[PDB]
Write a protein that binds this ligand. Structure first.
Ligand SMILES: NC(=O)c1c[se]c([C@@H]2O[C@H](COP(=O)(O)CP(=O)(O)OC[C@H]3O[C@@H](n4cnc5c(N)ncnc54)[C@H](O)[C@@H]3O)[C@@H](O)[C@H]2O)n1
Ligand SMILES: NC(=O)c1c[se]c([C@@H]2O[C@H](COP(=O)(O)CP(=O)(O)OC[C@H]3O[C@@H](n4cnc5c(N)ncnc54)[C@H](O)[C@@H]3O)[C@@H](O)[C@H]2O)n1
Ligand SMILES: [Zn+2]
Ligand SMILES: [Zn+2]
Ligand SMILES: [Zn+2]
Ligand SMILES: [Zn+2]
Lengths: 374, 374
């Protein structure tokens, strides 16, 4: 029934930054050529769209935020070859347009038709498909998943398995894939290796799961908050070290207990000081350090080039280096084949009308992951 | 004849820093087990042993500096399986002891029995084999090649081809191998790629030669001194850009002319600002930047983590990532097979008694490479 035409539905609008979201009724335009319209089912809440709210990630306001979700396909636009109505799908905040030189590159994943670098808050055609009372509402990362319905370009949706639990596989649209790929795809962790993960929120928990999948024989999880050590442990850490317990610097204590430094170090906290501390404690002649993510507000960090000189690799990346459209079906199939559990990351499930409440949880942080259901 | 016993010969001594070298007569002790004694033939002059002289590279004084040389084997000590008297050889300032975890590691090359990290200026047994009038003279990087004779441990000498031109292949003991490996072994430059080398002294010229060997279709050489552009060009650069010609920042102009940033950027200057500028102008989603070398005095450099986040790799290394003992024979055989020329790097050849003069050349810098002959 909704197929040819505009749908009217509730969605979360930010009309102004540093304001809670308004649940509004909006008009979701029908999809033009190579667009898909998706009925959302479950969307996670993540720091990055809370950065929008604070003014920190600058994306044009008013906006429908949301980038991490799974749902079902309703309308498909003209020339849509990959999805067909009724398909389970996950919006891709970092696309896979297939044509550019990053998509062609055998390792690059930060697709040039992305709205992260220079955010205009639109669909590829420069327009928006949201209007709240005639006023237009901008799209976020060409996903906007805090809406009952949304329209994405065919390069920003991946089709997934029919039997897929969408209240659990929506994590594969951001946080789980960002950490499990920082371990499996970016650092390319090895059989036998010693990994150290810094920070153990949902992303640090996804790293440990990846490092576990590659066969690391040690995963040292380090967090200044003791309460984090259990789930981390559950998920794969062999040891957990609380920096505030030692009189020394932890890179000392970590090189010390690693016999000269760990193989792979990962920075899941996002701070400048720990990006440096995690660089300084993988082995000198061959360790790899991977910055899993860095806040859009970050300033410069002081580092002494000597550290790289020994023979270290410093690596950063977006979405665990996964080419989005290719990989997300393959991760879901893996979840489907009981390779990894998403369950200890999902700590809360709230109805979508309780989005502001999910934020409260994220902001005082004891909440690994809040999922919002439609 | 000299074989069982102490040789008395001239060598360059630093008795005190910031002093020119004294040509002295010294007593080179006979080699103990697993030591080799080498009659030098040609040794190059390089910034690193001039850093010693300035106080900057702290190594114990008095010392016989010199790390880059080729020569012939005179005495071998007890249990020496790799060289036999009369063998052409090159002292290895960074060893290949075969046993440690860096030597075992498939990429690591900064061997743990090295005297670079924590320099004690001795042979592996903690003693010295030099005495000038009863007073002991320390060894440099377990090589000390500014002496007519020297003793090295069997892990710090590689045997090379009999027909080898030792006045030309001594470059393979430091400067040529440090740049040609930063291109061929560390960055692993590719067929078709666009490389940018920053700084074009003898090392930057060795990079261009490596990038050329890997098949890069562009080698942009960039130096604020115009006079460098010719030899660079000769050696393989396709274009040379002089930063002072543009009103803009060169990473702009370089990303601009590279269509979004080069593949591989190399910093051969050693400055902090250009380590940053070369990081910032390889492609965002997949470029690799390699710091070829950094002065022992360097302080911290300000950098914004964002640069790594896109998907960049920052890599440093010692001796072009070559495992010393394995690789140097293979490079010489390549020179021998007319794969690369060492000739445009060798600009001066002076007799060894003119060491201080070779320094003068290096310090006012128009001299690509001064070789000293015995
Ligand atoms: N901007 C990004 O792209 C990005 C990616 Se990861 C990231 C940062 O990570 C967080 C999101 O990832 P996440 O799911 O892990 C939520 P999080 O906030 O729980 O992650 C940070 C973790 O580090 C811990 N921590 C704080 N300081 C220290 C310290 N000095 N040493 C060791 N542990 C410490 C926290 O207790 C926590 O578990 C964000 O809140 C932000 O701080 N930003
Ligand atoms: N400490 C190390 O391990 C190490 C490795 Se190479 C390195 C530095 O490199 C030099 C040794 O290597 P080399 O054989 O190339 C001798 P060099 O001094 O000739 O190398 C530096 C090159 O960079 C050029 N240069 C200076 N400033 C700029 C600039 N702002 N932008 C572009 N070009 C510029 C110089 O004209 C020169 O060709 C040392 O003198 C030192 O400065 N230190
Ligand atoms: Zn693309
Ligand atoms: Zn996210
Ligand atoms: Zn070794
Ligand atoms: Zn050198």
């Amino acid at each position: 029934s909704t197929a040819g035409k505009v749908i009217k539905c509730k969605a979360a609008v930010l009309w102004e930054e540093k304001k809670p979201f308004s649940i509004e009724e909006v008009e979701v335009a029908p999809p033009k050529a190579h667009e898909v319209r998706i009925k959302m089912v479950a969307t996670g809440i993540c720091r990055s769209d809370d950065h929008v709210v604070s003014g920190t990630l600058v994306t044009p306001l008013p906006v429908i935020a949301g980038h991490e979700a799974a749902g079902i396909v309703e309308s498909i636009g003209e020339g849509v070859t990959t999805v067909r109505p009724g398909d389970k799908v996950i919006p891709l905040f970092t696309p896979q347009c297939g044509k550019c030189r990053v998509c062609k590159h055998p390792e690059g994943n930060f697709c040039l038709k992305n709205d992260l670098s220079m955010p205009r808050g639109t669909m590829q055609d420069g327009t928006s498909r949201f209007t709240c009372r005639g006023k237009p509402i901008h799209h976020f990362l060409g996903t906007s998943t805090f809406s009952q319905y949304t329209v994405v370009d065919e390069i920003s949706v991946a089709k997934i398995d029919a039997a897929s639990p969408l209240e659990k596989v929506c994590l594969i649209g951001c946080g789980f894939s960002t950490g499990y790929g920082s371990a499996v795809k970016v650092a390319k962790v090895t059989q036998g290796s010693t990994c150290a993960v810094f920070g153990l929120g949902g992303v640090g928990l996804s790293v440990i799961m990846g490092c576990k999948a590659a066969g690391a024989a040690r995963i040292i999880g380090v967090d200044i908050n003791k309460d984090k050590f259990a789930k981390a442990k559950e998920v794969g850490a062999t040891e957990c070290v609380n920096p505030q317990d030692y009189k020394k610097p932890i890179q000392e204590v970590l090189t010390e207990m690693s016999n000269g430094g760990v193989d792979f170090s990962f920075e899941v906290i996002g701070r400048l000081d720990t990006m440096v501390t995690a660089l300084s404690c993988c082995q000198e002649a061959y360790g790899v350090s991977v910055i899993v993510g860095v806040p859009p507000d970050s300033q410069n960090l002081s580092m002494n080039p000597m550290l790289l000189l020994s023979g270290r690799t410093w690596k950063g990346a977006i979405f665990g280096g996964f080419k989005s459209k290719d990989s997300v079906p393959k991760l879901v199939a893996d979840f489907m084949a009981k390779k990894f559990a998403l369950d200890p990351l999902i700590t809360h499930v709230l109805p979508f009308e309780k989005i502001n409440e999910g934020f409260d949880l994220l902001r005082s942080g004891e909440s690994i992951r809040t999922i919002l259901t439609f």
